[PDB]
Design a protein around this ligand. Structure first.
Ligand SMILES: Cc1ccc2c(c1)c(-c1nnn[nH]1)c1n2C[C@@](NC(=O)c2ccc(-n3cnnc3)cc2Cl)(c2ccccc2)CC1
Ligand code: NA
Lengths: 235, 54
């Protein structure tokens, strides 16, 4: 996240970090004690991924971290990296052992398709992650967050030479200086509704992070809610 | 009183019901409160809530 601020411990308790050959290569959100939702491009070539919930400072041991291994990866059935790495860019991770829910490890709420879409229409969401803090710069140590406004479709299409489909949205600032960046992909875009946060997007991709005239691209979660609820149901 | 106006005063979800009334509801882990609008936690760590002191 470029132009964000340090989160306080427990401020985004649904946030997870994905670690592999490099740390904090992507983010994720807690659906429930056994399931994480992330971007499919983060987990396509299934290397040994470690999920860390309750994380704050990725370089310090702070006692709230819960590390888990991934036993199953479910990309969306329409995901096909040979066609486009970034279309239908959503996946579910099944954890080896359930997380222990507490004030630092709490799921994100997921509304039905209709309300997920209404919440996105509020026009302002929070994104968070350990991604780069400048374009081509270092990864964050402390979790970063930023409030991002929804950007209209036409503006979004004019901003990039790549195609943006209706299951994706743009968010950011016309002036630059504030945006998601590499390493944040897979993390949450959430909308606060009277003090309760709902998952409204998945951080997907971007080009020159925070450059004026560029915007972060996100997966619209409303399109995938029924699939998430069915696949992650514990009963 | 409809779900189109201020979400029927429902804190989370709203459904239009008989005789120009609405029925509010909440996500998993919350209970609809006695005031018929608010959502109260019904589990120790309900989703989407910040419980650590900020
Ligand atoms: C949120 C966010 C934000 C920014 C992110 C990313 C994520 C990622 C990224 N995420 N995961 N893997 N790479 C990158 N970046 C910046 C980076 N982006 C790309 O190379 C890139 C280019 C094209 C496309 N694309 C093509 N068709 N649809 C999408 C996607 C990316 Cl990620 C780049 C672009 C120009 C110059 C330097 C670098 C490199 C990779
Ligand atoms: Na830590």
């Amino acid at each position: 996240v470029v132009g964000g601020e340090d989160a306080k411990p427990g401020q985004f308790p649904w946030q997870v970090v994905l670690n592999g050959k490099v740390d904090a290569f992507c983010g994720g959100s807690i659906v429930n004690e056994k399931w994480i939702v992330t971007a499919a491009h983060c987990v396509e070539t299934g290397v040994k991924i470690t999920v860390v919930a309750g994380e704050h400072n990725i370089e310090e041991t702070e006692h709230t971290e819960q590390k888990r291994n991934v036993i199953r990866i479910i990309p969306h059935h329409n995901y096909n990296a040979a066609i486009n790495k970034y279309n239908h860019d959503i996946a579910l991770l099944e954890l080896d052992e359930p997380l222990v829910l507490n004030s630092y490890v709490t799921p994100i709420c997921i509304a039905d398709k209709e309300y997920t879409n209404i919440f996105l229409k509020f026009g302002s969401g929070y994104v968070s992650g350990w991604g780069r803090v400048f374009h081509k710069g270092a990864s964050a140590l402390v979790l970063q967050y930023l409030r991002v406004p929804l950007v209209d479709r036409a503006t979004c299409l004019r901003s990039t030479k790549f195609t943006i489909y209706n299951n994706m949205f743009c968010a950011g600032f016309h002036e630059g200086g504030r945006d998601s960046c590499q390493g944040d992909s897979g993390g949450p875009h959430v909308t606060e509704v009277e003090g309760t946060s709902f998952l409204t997007g998945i951080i997907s991709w971007g080009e020159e992070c925070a450059m004026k005239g560029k915007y972060g691209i996100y997966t619209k979660v409303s399109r995938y809610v029924n699939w998430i609820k069915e696949k992650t149901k514990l009963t | 009183v409809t779900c189109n106006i201020k979400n029927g005063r429902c804190e989370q979800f709203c459904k239009n019901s008989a005789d120009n009334k609405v029925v509010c509801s909440c996500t998993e882990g919350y209970r609809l409160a006695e005031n018929q609008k608010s959502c109260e936690p019904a589990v120790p760590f309900p989703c989407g809530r910040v419980s650590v002191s900020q």
